[PDB]
Paper text:
The β‐barrel assembly machinery (BAM complex) is essential for outer membrane protein (OMP) folding in Gram‐negative bacteria, and represents a promising antimicrobial target. BAM is thought to exist in two major conformations, defined by closing (lateral‐closed) or opening (lateral‐open) of a membrane‐facing gate in the core component BamA, itself an OMP.
DAR‐B therefore promotes a transition to the lateral‐closed conformation in vitro, as observed for equivalent BAM structures (in detergent micelles) bound to the darobactin variants DAR‐A and DAR‐9. DAR‐B formed a similar binding interface to β1 of BAM to that previously observed for DAR‐B bound to BamA alone (X‐ray crystal structure) or DAR‐A bound to the intact BAM complex (cryoEM structure).
Author numbering:
A (entry chain A): 24 to 808
B (entry chain D): 24 to 242
C (entry chain C): 30 to 87
D (entry chain G): 1 to 7
E (entry chain B): 29 to 392
F (entry chain E): 27 to 111
Amino acid sequence: FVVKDIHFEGLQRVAVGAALLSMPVRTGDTVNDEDISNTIRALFATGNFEDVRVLRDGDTLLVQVKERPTIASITFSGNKSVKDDMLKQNLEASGVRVGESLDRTTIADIEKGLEDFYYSVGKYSASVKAVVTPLPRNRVDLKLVFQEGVSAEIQQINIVGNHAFTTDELISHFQLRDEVPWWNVVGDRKYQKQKLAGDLETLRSYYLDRGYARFNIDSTQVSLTPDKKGIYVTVNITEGDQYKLSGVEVSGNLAGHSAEIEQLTKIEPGELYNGTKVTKMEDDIKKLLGRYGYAYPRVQSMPEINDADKTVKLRVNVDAGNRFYVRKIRFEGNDTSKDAVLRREMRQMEGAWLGSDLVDQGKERLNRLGFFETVDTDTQRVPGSPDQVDVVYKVKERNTGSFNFGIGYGTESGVSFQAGVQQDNWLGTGYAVGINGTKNDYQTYAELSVTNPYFTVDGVSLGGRLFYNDFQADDADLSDYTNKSYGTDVTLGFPINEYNSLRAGLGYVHNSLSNMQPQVAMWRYLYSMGEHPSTSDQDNSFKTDDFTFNYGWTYNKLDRGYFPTDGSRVNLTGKVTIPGSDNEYYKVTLDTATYVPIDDDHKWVVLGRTRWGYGDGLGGKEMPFYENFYAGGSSTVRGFQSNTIGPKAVYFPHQASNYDPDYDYECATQDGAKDLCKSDDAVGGNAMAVASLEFITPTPFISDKYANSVRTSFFWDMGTVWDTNWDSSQYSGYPDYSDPSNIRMSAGIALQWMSPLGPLVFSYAQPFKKYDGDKAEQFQFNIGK
Amino acid sequence: KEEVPDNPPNEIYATAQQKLQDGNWRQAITQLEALDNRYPFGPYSQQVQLDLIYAYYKNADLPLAQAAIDRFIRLNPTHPNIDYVMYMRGLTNMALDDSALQGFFGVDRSDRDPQHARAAFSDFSKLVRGYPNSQYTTDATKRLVFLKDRLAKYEYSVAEYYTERGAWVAVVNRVEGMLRDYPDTQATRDALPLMENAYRQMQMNAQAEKVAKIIAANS
Amino acid sequence: RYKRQVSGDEAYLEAAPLAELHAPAGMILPVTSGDYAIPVTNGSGAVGKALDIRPPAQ
Amino acid sequence: WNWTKRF
Amino acid sequence: VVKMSPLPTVENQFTPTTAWSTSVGSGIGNFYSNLHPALADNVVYAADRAGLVKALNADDGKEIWSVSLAEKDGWFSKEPALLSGGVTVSGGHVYIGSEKAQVYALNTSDGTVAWQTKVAGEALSRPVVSDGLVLIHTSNGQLQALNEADGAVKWTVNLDMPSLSLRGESAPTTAFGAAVVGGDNGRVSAVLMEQGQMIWQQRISQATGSTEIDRLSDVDTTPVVVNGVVFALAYNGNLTALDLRSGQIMWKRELGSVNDFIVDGNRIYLVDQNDRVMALTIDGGVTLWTQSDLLHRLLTSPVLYNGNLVVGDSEGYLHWINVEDGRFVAQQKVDSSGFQTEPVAADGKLLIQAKDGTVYSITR
Amino acid sequence: VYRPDINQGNYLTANDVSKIRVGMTQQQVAYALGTPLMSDPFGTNTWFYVFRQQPGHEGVTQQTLTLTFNSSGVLTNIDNKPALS
């Protein structure tokens, strides 16, 4: 029968006109049962209603439609391992959001995705229920309840068909672990998917670096226990033979630079086929081609394998593309940090030909900045242009301010407290401002520093620092004297290369010494300065203000920051007090470390530590007694008490201000002293020379798993500190401290590893060449921050 | 917390209006959200949506606002007062551009991300073009001028940086672009000397003479 | 937070009025392309904090 | 031990 | 998380007692393995994960001999042999699998290695001897048949291997010159002894819906053939009866598990995934009695002893239940470390092994 | 490294520069060398294929190539210098 009206009963969301035009029927047109069915199907297919029921009321079709309910709210309970924000985002990705129509069917796929996500999080046996609670006016409350069960963990990473390499030596480099000791940070046992592919790639690279050019992973099987709490990963591989490099030939479109390319691709006769070195040569060729102005050079290295002589020949196809020119660089997402803070880390210059490696270099610099959580790149094309591009960077701003509070232990520091608050991006202008504080056993330190890392476009840094430093020499195993000081320093830093840096600056420091202990060297310094205190008095007071010019040079090339294996590191610091200050002197120190590898895998290493230092007064003055060098302890030479090595203090016949019976109080007349008497209280000379030869070897008694997480070594240390300005033949009854020939030696064994509590460093030492008066310490243990 | 009593929708509207005129925007937002999620497409859902947009702006929940105007303009594309809706969108974008990690103290934030400024400029331009006789056209034009000046200042800042480093071709291209796209703004007047210097430093003098003449004419 | 609360009250109506660059004889500055060209129109309301943004009565 | 909290 | 049900408060009529208890090299520890003791000729052969194999007296558990199959280069280097293939002492010799793709073959008398062989991959399935050959079902989706004399790879058959499986491989069973086996893929396959000739392959997996990880991946435990009819099980699948000649489905029951089941007379006793022991009718799998008191206790495959069903559990309690009605008959504690692997009953002697490797002989 | 290697302008290989000649249309010149990075905007068909280059601290070296296009869209006079002067 003919139709002349549609009721649209219960249509609050979809507009009446929109619903009417959605169906393929117009008013006044003949309608049959087939037409009614087609209209119902079309309306259902619109994806806006859950049920369509049409009733023929008189001559008008009463189209009763069950509308799609809107998401009143979504309630989650029991997600103790996953925050509901990520669940909300996942629901958004599927279109289910508060205030959106709930189709009652896509929610099934959403809960399937949630169950898959829970599987991905390690909760394998968990259960998910997407219950729907009806609410008036066709509303739905979506209660995504679930039970997380218990997480699964890996139980074995087994490799079959491997020879010449134990499974332990191969599963170590995996980011996926199977045995994680409590006393050593090595990672979690949670199982992932992308990590498995990464580990298989790592295995491939490890086998290909050793010459096994025919290595091929047959397959990989992951299994679950019936209890569903244990993963079992097996990797069936097939290792070939150790091949050798027959030769490498470059072919293709070299852009007329065959000579340099051939020079770069040179190999010694009969070298081992190393995939890493092959890729390094490929990237060197890419760099050479790019430097001449090719944006997208192509290098395809195919190895041809001849088993007759067990040889591999590298056919490298080179194809330099076209030339592209970067029209302009854009930065997106930097709502806080200004454009300069991001555009000065770019090694690619706008308005110049394109280099992809340069873009990735700038990307890594932006990553190392620390301000940005994620930083992606896009070499977008300029519309209506053949060879012009724009290099867009999309950054997601991260937080910068942070306050930290650490605590550590040590034999040279007792218990050490550290606290501070830092802001590495002041209002997004590059300036970094921080407040730091430390409390040692014998000193306290408060610092406020503000640095501009880019004072010149080149990269010269300019920093300022205000410090208040209190020193209690009594607690530092030294002669009794308190020193409260405060000062401010302004410095400039010049970088020469990636492995060198100069620092030059000025500083002003005001010191105040009190409670000083009458002794020969300190009184000599005071006499030289111009003050003559009374030896009898125990409570003295002195204060000075000095302006100093500081210079320094640091060269750092260590291959690995933690547990180095190869490279040098030389630091040379120095200072001279400028005219117009109470003190007149200069000082210089030079500490060197050098790790030389002896094996091929960088497992057996030799560490050549050294430390020289010398300082002296310029005119008739003397170098301050609160700035002399020190030795012994754990830092300089193991096997001695902290600060013990060096000249000892000679005390005058003084009466202590506070005295208690049976207490030495530094050879006090109260105890009965009436003449100069030598003691074991170190004072510290003004010339220091220390050296140490250490052999680093793999730790013997430990599973080959995580065997590189503990560093074990045997050390032999030599040290000597002396006072050059000690008066010659001043007294025949005491040792000639000015003599430098006296050299102390020790030998021992040291261990280090990264415990959850921090970096732990144990050492047992024996000072077989200790001289008279030196305090002997044997077991030096440090529990890092 | 953030729970509204179950009352008739007219009562919800009344309390919402009272709290809006009072000043407490958060409570008004909660009441409007409860009203909207309690009566999906109610008798006056359009008024509730407009009140939601206004309250989201006032509370400074700019992203939630932006979402609200997006959903509204999707739903009803011919509502008589849609011009107010586009004005609200422009204000939302301008506000988003005006952000501050610590606060607004004259840092001028002229070299941060300007995408919000471009979006606001586009929205205001479309508004002024569509409805020349609206009540919000004067403010739209003034905000357009402000946004144009801000974008010109950003371009001048980039030109200044590349003058500092020494990418003369980059400086020339950037200044030429900001001359093509923002001729009226004052940043072009201060940027032209950079282009003249860039031409001078690359041993090119004819273009340097032309830019010097340009600078001499306007001053 | 209040990262955008200051924007509740903006003002900032004191931007310097735009002025076109005069073209000296012998050369022409490049075409504008009209991408950011600001149309000339006059509205019926106020600008300096007086105009209200309250929703329109329905 | 050392604890940092990026506020 | 589904809770572990409490132990049963049942008065025992007869008190189980251990005739003797011997120690082995720490057992299989926590790893999920099929290693179990084997009794033959009044001699108990036991093994361990480390690579230690012992032959002891059955009557009183005195050591007859012991050999450490683990390789060792000097007094400082020694890697475990990872024995995870059970013991199948039969017709002389002693066959043990490994997770390094090794099938050790020792001599019953003294234990000297008879021969060694390399297999396709990990060999977890219990080796089965028949017709002068040894069948090993590996975890690499392969089924190998090796010679019993010189230990040469007679032939191999390839079976599909899903991405995610259950840590276990079914042990093939042979009859009338045909070996039936169930791979990790939900398909029971029959092959010929002479060579890897496939006769028929029938799928018995159930509930193949859902597209996720940890799906309803069925795995076969141990098909058993009697009077020309095969009976098969599958994790989350259907206990199915198949025709040996053509592999045609006869009758199915919607219950699944990974632990073995016993067929006695006209009664099939089994245990489900949820740790419920029950008995079904051979004719059509008609449920007769059910016992669900030991829910989720990780019980082992049941054993028949004097008309009673004996089952161990993770907590270390051995339960004896009456087969006729399914009521508990006795409960005993034998070891704190717990019981994981299946027990053995032969010559009126019941032997079990615990996660610590201790071998227990239970009188009754 | 103090300053990086700063490059500006088009890349004239010192060979394709000789490839050009008087009488080629704009499309042909763009094909031979490439679209110029900068150009004269003050109403005159002129292209500048500046090849400024600085290998860090070595010293800036530039090769200016003025390619003036006549009013008919064709080259009128090639000029170029390889030194800053």
